Subunit: 66 residues, 6 copies
């Protein structure tokens, strides 16, 4: 279960459940858009158009929606 203080998993779990199209920005400023299919403490599985990406959280800067 997710604690009220853990806003990261609350957000990721909602993105996952709702299949929302999210934009992931990386440390170098580049971005990819897709649906978060699964995630854990180290990685995020992002389903994009014609591409499947396995992203390390250590390389992520930001998530944004819309």
């Amino acid at each position: 279960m997710i604690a009220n203080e853990n806003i990261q998993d609350k957000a990721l779990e909602n993105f996952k459940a709702n299949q929302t199209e999210v934009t992931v920005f990386f440390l170098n400023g580049f971005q990819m858009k897709g649906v978060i299919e699964e995630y854990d403490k180290y990685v995020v599985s992002l389903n994009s158009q014609g591409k499947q990406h396995l992203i390390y959280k250590h390389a992520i800067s930001t998530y944004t929606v819309e």
Copy 2:
């Protein structure tokens, strides 16, 4: 703790802050929520969930 107290104050006061990232890019907004690892910044009408590992500076 300096950081925990600063973020608590930014959220409570709805302080406008510019977040600078490690690569030098910047985003100005209001911190709506935060936790030990991420900050949720509302900027230009949209929410951004930012990892603290990617933040360089908060400019007040």
Copy 3:
């Protein structure tokens, strides 16, 4: 477990994987082996031992 499952799938199927590094450079090759810290990627006739700390994404 997500990571090991994907990496084992790439290795078992000799899948053409494009590795994006932290600086944004990309290298397309085949994963020959991997462990908790590194991945061995064969690309254009050369062997590359890559630290996972330097990887941003694996794309197929």
Copy 4:
């Protein structure tokens, strides 16, 4: 502690310190406070809360 002793000195003496970031940018100002994870640097009329993980070097003249 080398680091704690320098920051202690910069703060007490209000030294003009130039902080270099990992990306090479630099910011010159005065250290107002610091702890294990952050440094607060006043520069050109504004407060800056800087993560030590993003700092490369402190340079003083």
Copy 5:
């Protein structure tokens, strides 16, 4: 441990290896020593003590 086995062989056999860094720069030489955190690389009239945290890739033929 792929990395330790690889580094052990590179050192024992004086393998010419190219080290790429996180910023994409590269340096070719021979690994003379290494431990959990650093690699000592001899390259063109220079000795380089490199932190593994700054290494992206080791390439060999």
Copy 6:
């Protein structure tokens, strides 16, 4: 310990060390002091307190 042995040598011999940072910038100077997390480097008259997390390589001739 490879790292400590090297830094001990550099400090004891006032060796001209070029420190390369993660972003590729370099600074040539003399190691005056160091510890687990930082290195103090004198260069062109100024003192620099550098975080090892921001260092890529120590290079010497």
